[PDB]
Amino acid sequence: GKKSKATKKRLAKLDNQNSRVPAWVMLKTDERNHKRRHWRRNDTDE
Amino acid sequence: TGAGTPSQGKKNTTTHTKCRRCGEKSYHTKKKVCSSCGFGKSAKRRDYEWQSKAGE
Amino acid sequence: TDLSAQKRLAADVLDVGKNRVWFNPERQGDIADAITREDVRELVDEGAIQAKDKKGNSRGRARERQKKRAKGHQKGAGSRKGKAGARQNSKEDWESRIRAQRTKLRELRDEGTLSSSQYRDLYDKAGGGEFDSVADLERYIDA
RNA sequence: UAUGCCAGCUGGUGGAUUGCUCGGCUCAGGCGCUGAUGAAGGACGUGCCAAGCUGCGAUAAGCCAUGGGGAGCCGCACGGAGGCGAAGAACCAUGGAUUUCCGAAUGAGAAUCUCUAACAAUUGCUUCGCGCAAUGAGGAACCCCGAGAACUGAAACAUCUC
RNA sequence: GUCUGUUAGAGUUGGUGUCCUACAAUACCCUCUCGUGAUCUAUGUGUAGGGGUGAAAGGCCCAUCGAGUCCGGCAACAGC
RNA sequence: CUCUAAUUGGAUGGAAGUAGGGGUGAAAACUCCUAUGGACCGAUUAGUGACGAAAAUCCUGGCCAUAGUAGCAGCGAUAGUCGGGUGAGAACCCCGACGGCCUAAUGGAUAAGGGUUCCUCAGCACUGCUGAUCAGCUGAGGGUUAGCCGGUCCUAAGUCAUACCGCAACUCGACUAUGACGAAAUGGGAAACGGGUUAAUAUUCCCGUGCCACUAUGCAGUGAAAGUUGACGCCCUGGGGUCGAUCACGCUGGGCAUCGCCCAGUCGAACCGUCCAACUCCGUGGAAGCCGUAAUGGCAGGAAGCGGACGAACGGCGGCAUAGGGAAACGUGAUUCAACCUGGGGCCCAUGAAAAGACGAGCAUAGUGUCCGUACCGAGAACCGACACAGGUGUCCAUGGCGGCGAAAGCCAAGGCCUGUCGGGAGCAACCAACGUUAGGGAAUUCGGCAAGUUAGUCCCGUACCUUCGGAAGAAGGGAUGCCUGCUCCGGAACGGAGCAGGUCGCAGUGACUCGGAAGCUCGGACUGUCUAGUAACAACAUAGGUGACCGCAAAUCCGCAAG
RNA sequence: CACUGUCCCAACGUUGGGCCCGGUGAACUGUACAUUCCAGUGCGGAGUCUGGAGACACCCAGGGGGAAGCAAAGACCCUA
RNA sequence: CCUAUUAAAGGAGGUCGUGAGCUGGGUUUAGACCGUCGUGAGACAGGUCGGCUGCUAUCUACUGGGUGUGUAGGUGUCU
RNA sequence: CGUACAAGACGCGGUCGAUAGACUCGGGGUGUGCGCGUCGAGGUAACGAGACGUUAAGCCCACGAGCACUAACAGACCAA
Ligand SMILES: [Cl-]
Ligand SMILES: [Mg+2]
Ligand SMILES: [Mg+2]
Ligand SMILES: [Mg+2]
Ligand SMILES: [Mg+2]
Ligand SMILES: [Mg+2]
Ligand SMILES: [Mg+2]
Ligand SMILES: [Mg+2]
Ligand SMILES: [Mg+2]
Ligand SMILES: [Mg+2]
Ligand SMILES: [Mg+2]
Ligand SMILES: [Mg+2]
Ligand SMILES: [Mg+2]
Ligand SMILES: [Mg+2]
Ligand SMILES: [Mg+2]
Ligand SMILES: [Mg+2]
Ligand SMILES: [Mg+2]
Ligand SMILES: [Mg+2]
Ligand code: NA
Ligand code: NA
Ligand code: NA
Ligand code: NA
Ligand code: NA
Ligand code: NA
Ligand SMILES: [Sr+2]
Ligand SMILES: [Sr+2]
Ligand SMILES: [Sr+2]
Ligand SMILES: [Sr+2]
Ligand SMILES: [Sr+2]
Ligand SMILES: [Sr+2]
Ligand SMILES: [Sr+2]
Ligand SMILES: [Sr+2]
Ligand SMILES: [Sr+2]
Ligand SMILES: [Sr+2]
Ligand SMILES: [Sr+2]
Ligand SMILES: [Sr+2]
Ligand SMILES: [Sr+2]
Ligand SMILES: [Sr+2]
Ligand SMILES: [Sr+2]
Ligand SMILES: [Sr+2]
Ligand SMILES: [Sr+2]
Ligand SMILES: [Sr+2]
Ligand SMILES: [Sr+2]
Ligand SMILES: [Sr+2]
Ligand SMILES: [Sr+2]
Ligand SMILES: [Sr+2]
Ligand SMILES: [Sr+2]
Ligand SMILES: [Sr+2]
Ligand SMILES: [Sr+2]
Ligand SMILES: [Sr+2]
Ligand SMILES: [Sr+2]
Ligand SMILES: [Sr+2]
Ligand SMILES: [Sr+2]
Ligand SMILES: [Sr+2]
Ligand SMILES: [Sr+2]
Ligand SMILES: [Sr+2]
C-alpha cells in the first residue's frame, strides 16, 4: 500500500507510543505499558 | 467455495478509515462518510436517542 | 560463531548465488570478525572466502543423438510421440513447397526458357497443387 | 505391607472472611448557556531522562500583571542528574499573552493534508465593494413546533388499549 | 457457445476414501468436468432490508436469510 | 444478618475474622478454651431492610480427577549424516564435506493489505508444536535521499457539493445547470541510462553520460490552425526483427583422465546520428491473359517492368566508449526467432472509451524544476481466516538444458532450501492409514463391478446400425514400433519432416514416464450453458425455435409521497 | 466381450503411525458409591433393591458387549 | 418364486441380538418429474431420479501380558 | 544372544565357552563381470549395435561348519 504524509505521522506516533515504561518511572512509583502493541498480533486503525 | 475461512482470504479492501472529524476509524473512504459522527453526510453531529436506554 | 551476515555480504561482493560462497572452515574466527563489505573483500583476496563454480548441463549425449537424427535415425514409429501434423505443420510445409515452385518458375522466365503465357499456365497449375515438388515440376515442364 | 480410604497436623495453592475506603448511588440547595473575535470535539506535538494520565500549544506540565501566600519548589510519580527561589519561587484568586492542524469549518480540494487571496452558502442593509451585519454547530436533561410504531391489554381479535 | 488436453485458469461425478476435540466452523488425496466463450479473472463502480440481486435452488446480500446486522421499543407476552 | 436511635458494656493486660477443641439449646443458634490475628466489637429495647441457599443445562472466581493421557506421523516437499565453530549448556545457531528437496515454483520482481516486521549490537523471563547460544521474540540504537519511478495532471462507469424544486421537515429525494471528485500492479501520460557505493537506500547518493519542461537572454521566425496524434474489438496470417536457445570455427579459463570429450566466458546502455521493409501516392510504360499471394486477390477507371515522393522497430549500422565491467579472452558467422515494428485476410441482429496532452512549430546559453510515496514481507511464519492455520489471496518473469506435439511427465541447471521444524529405540507384535505382489477360478462379491483393474502414445490397413448428411468414428477389428551401418526423398535449411536396404539384442522397444477399455438395448433432457457458498449437478433453470397478449410514442409496461 | 484379490480365501511385503524412551502437553466427561454375574423385584428395560453365585490388590496392551455410553431442553407426534 | 447340488439344505429367542461394528439399497427433511386430488398455497399410508452416518473408553465386561501381597530359604518334579 | 517378545515376561550361553561377529570352507540365489583379444552389417577412414573367448564367470546370502582372532570382560549386590 501507499501511505499519505498524514498516515505516516500517525503510524510514526503509534511506533514511538509502543515503548517500555522508563526504568526510572518504576522506581519513582515504587513498582507495564498497557498499550504495548505487536505488528502481527494486534491491528492499528486505518 | 465455503463462505467461511475460504472467503476471508479475499478480504484486503480498505473501507473504514480514521475520520478527520471525530478521530474514529469509521470514515468509509469509498463512501466518504463517517458511520460514527456522520462526517461528510451531516453538518450536525451523528446522535440518536436509541444509543441509550429510553429513560436515560 | 554465526556467519550468516557475512555469507549474504560475500554473495553480493563475489556476486554469485548465496549457495555458492565457500568460507574456509579454519577461518571462521576471522570471517566472524568481518563487519563491512571491505572486510569481506579483503578476506576474498586472501582466499578465505571463495565462490564455487556454477554447473552447466552436458549436451554431449544430446549432440550424439542430434547427429543420428539429422542422419535420419532414431525417428522410427516407436520414437514418435506427436501426431504427424504436429511433427510437421502441413500449411507450413505447403508455404515451403509452393514458394520453391514459384521461385523456380520465376527464374525460368527471366532466363528466357519460358514465355510469359507458359509461365502463367504453369504458375496457376502450381497454385492449384499440380506439382508435388520442384523436381516434379521440372519433369512436367520437360513435356 | 504396596496401590489406597477417612480425619488431623506442617507447608502450599486459592482469595472467601473480618477490618479499612481515594469510588459509587440517591436526595437537597445554588447556579446555568457556548460558537465565524472559529466553539464543543478530535489529531499531532510539547518534559533533561517521558510510555500512560493530566496540563499546555512552536512562548507548548508553561509566559505577564494585581492581590493573596510563603521557605520552600520543579504534576500524578516515593528515581537519578541538574535547576529555580529573599530580584519573594512554588501555590491560590482575578485579569491578560501565546493558542499548530482537522473540526459549523466558510477560497478550492483532502481519511487531520494539499493547492492557488477568499464571510463558502443563504440573506438583510447597502457608499451596490463581502463595505457593515446575520445564519450555520455544540450543550446532561428540561422546553416549544412537527412525523409517529409495535410488542402488549382486551386472557383470540379488527374499534379500543399499549 | 467443435473435439483432446492437470498449459494457464474455472469447476467438482464417484471414493459415501482421509479428516470429523481437524491443518481447516466446509480442509487433503485420487478419479472426474470445463478450458475461444452465454468463458475465466483483477480493480473500480452501482443496486439495501418487505427492499435489492436471482439462467429460479427460497439461491445470495460479510461463518447470519421463507425477510441481513446493530442498537432501541424492552424488564414484550405465555394459561408452558 | 445490615445499618439507626435510646439505655448500657467489652478491646493493644489483645477487638473482629479464621483454625482446632470444650459446654448449652429439640432446634434455628448461643457460648467458652487454645493457636492465629493486630484493630475494632457487642447486649437490651424500639426501628430499618438490596436479611438467611444444595439445587434454577443458575452467575463469577478458583480447583481436582480425566493424564504425564490425545496431539507434536499421514498432504507426491519421507532429510538428513560425519567432522568442527561459539557457548555455562548444542539433534535442530554457524562453517565444511557428504546426502537430498523446489523448476509457473520452495526461484526473481511487485499490487493490495500489514506497519517497522527491515539493519546492527546485547540478550533468552515471554513468543516458537521439543531444545536453543537462534529468531518475524526482548532491550538499545540505526535505516527509506528522485526535474526524468509512482503520486501529482486527464477523463471512465459513476460520486459528491452548490443552485433549483419536492417534503410537515431534514442529515432525505429524482431531473436540469455549475463546480469538483473518481484509475499508485492494470486506462491516457513531457523526460534516465550504465556503473560504483552501504550493515540497512539507490533510474533517488556518487561517477560518467543523456534527456524533458518552463522561464530568461540572443539569433532566427512570422508562419499557428487546418490536420495528424493521443485512440482502441474478436479470429487467421505474411514480412521485418532483438533477447534467448542451439549449430560451426577461433580466443580465455576450468574440469576429467584408458578414451577425447565436458563446462563456463568471450561483455558494453540510455541517448545522438543514420538506414528502411510494408502501406499510400506520382512519372514512365502499354498488358485484351498477363501480374501477384500462405490465402484473398489486381488491371485500359491503366497490369508487369523502370524511376520517384512519402515512410518502421524496444531493430541494423557509427558515435556514446584510451565510459564502464572483466582474472583473462575481451569472437565471427548461421538457424529458429519472445519483445518491438509493419502488412494482408475473415466476422458482427455484437461495432469494440473519453479527456488532458503531444506533434504541426528552429537553434544557443543560463536559470528553475517545489510538494508526497520510497525500509521490509508479499506468504505451508510479516496479508484475511482468533494461530508462526495443509485454506484463501491480484500481476509479470510462458524462450534455461535433455525430453516430447507440448507452457505435459520424468530428470537436471541458474537461484532457493533441509522451517510443509520435536526427537530417540524395538526385523519394529496386534490393529489402522496409504501402497506393492498374489496360484487356480474369474463378478460367484454387491442394491449396483462400489473399489481396483483392463485399454493407452504414433503410423499403416480397416470400420456396422443409424443420421438432421454435419455426424456416428479413435466405431469395432488387425498389423507395426528399439538399436546399429549406409542411404533416398521434400525443403534454402534446421540441432525439421517422410521413407529404403542390410546388421542386431531383450521375456518385453509409446520398454520408465506420458498414455481411451470396447460394443448393444431402453428412459430423460435436443445441444454448449445454469443451480441449492456448506449433504441434491439432475430429468430441475436457461436456450434458439414456436405461440398468444398489450401498445402509434402526450403509447404499452414499470419506480417515486412528491419534485421526478 | 475384455480384465481383475469384488469374491472363493486369504498370504507375504512397503511407507507412516501404533509399542518402549527424553521433552512438550490439552480436551470430552464427573450426584454419590462402585470387583461383578445369573435370576427376581421395581414406574413393566437394575453395577447400587432381594436371593444366590463369584470376587486377593494393582498395572500394561486390545477390540468396543453394557453403563437404555458421550454429544444437541426431540427437528417426528400432540398440546399452546 | 425359481435353478443346480445335498445326508438335510428345520423353524425361533437374544432391545423383531448385533450402526460409540460395517453397509446405506428401502423408509423418512431440504431439489425435481408423473399420475390423482385441490381455485390456490399445496397434498398423497402412489410411483420416480438426487440427496450426510460425530466422539482421544472414566467405569464395567471379556481376550492376552505383567507387578505385588497371602499361603511362609531355594532348586527340580508333580498332584 | 534368541527356540521368546508391543512394556514386562520367557529361554540359552558367559573362557570349566562356539553365545554373537570377522575370516575360510560348505550349502544356496542370480546367470556368465571389468578389461583385453578375435569376429562384426558396413564405412577411405574415423567409427561400429552386437557375437565369441577369457568365464559353471562376476556379484550376493536373514543358513550350516570350522575356527577363541574380536566381543561374552571387569565386577557389584541381595540372601534364611
Ligand atoms: Cl500478406
Ligand atoms: Mg490444411
Ligand atoms: Mg391480547
Ligand atoms: Mg437497655
Ligand atoms: Mg449467600
Ligand atoms: Mg486414557
Ligand atoms: Mg534492498
Ligand atoms: Mg509453520
Ligand atoms: Mg448374493
Ligand atoms: Mg533436396
Ligand atoms: Mg423403465
Ligand atoms: Mg441437458
Ligand atoms: Mg451443496
Ligand atoms: Mg422463445
Ligand atoms: Mg433389531
Ligand atoms: Mg450397538
Ligand atoms: Mg453410528
Ligand atoms: Mg467412534
Ligand atoms: Na496487523
Ligand atoms: Na451553573
Ligand atoms: Na456585498
Ligand atoms: Na527444529
Ligand atoms: Na525445449
Ligand atoms: Na433398540
Ligand atoms: Sr493474523
Ligand atoms: Sr480482494
Ligand atoms: Sr453528503
Ligand atoms: Sr438526530
Ligand atoms: Sr470448446
Ligand atoms: Sr455421495
Ligand atoms: Sr482410492
Ligand atoms: Sr467434513
Ligand atoms: Sr476438454
Ligand atoms: Sr431489549
Ligand atoms: Sr438476597
Ligand atoms: Sr489440570
Ligand atoms: Sr517427521
Ligand atoms: Sr493427515
Ligand atoms: Sr535458560
Ligand atoms: Sr531478520
Ligand atoms: Sr483527479
Ligand atoms: Sr499507468
Ligand atoms: Sr484478448
Ligand atoms: Sr519471421
Ligand atoms: Sr524496494
Ligand atoms: Sr498459499
Ligand atoms: Sr542448484
Ligand atoms: Sr522449533
Ligand atoms: Sr517379485
Ligand atoms: Sr455381477
Ligand atoms: Sr449376482
Ligand atoms: Sr490396436
Ligand atoms: Sr456455485
Ligand atoms: Sr482403544
Ligand atoms: Sr439410503
Ligand atoms: Sr490378609
**Cβ within 8 Å, pair A10-B25:** no
User: Is B23 flagged in the annotation as binding?
Assistant: no
Contact C2, C33 (CB under 8 A): no
Helices vs. strands in chain A: H and E counts, helices first: 2, 0
Q: How many CA atoms lie within 13 A of B11 on its CB side?
A: 7
Experimental method: X-ray
Ligand 41: centre distance to CA B30 (Å): 15
Domain boundaries, chain C: 1-55, 56-88, 89-143
Reported structure resolution in angstroms: 2.7
- CA torsion sign for C85, C86, C88, C92 is positive
Contact B21, B15 (CB under 8 A): no
Spanning CA of B32 to C1' of D121, the rounded length in angstroms is 21
> What domains can be seen in chain A, in order of their start residue?
1-46 (1.10.1620.10)
Terminal Cα distance for chain B, rounded: 47
- B41–A contact, CB cutoff 8 A: no
Query: The CATH number of C56-88 is which of 1.10.10.60, 1.20.5.560, 1.20.120.640, 3.40.50.300?
Result: 1.20.5.560
Q: Is the CB of B23 under 7 A from strand D?
A: yes
- A10–B contact, CB cutoff 8 A: yes
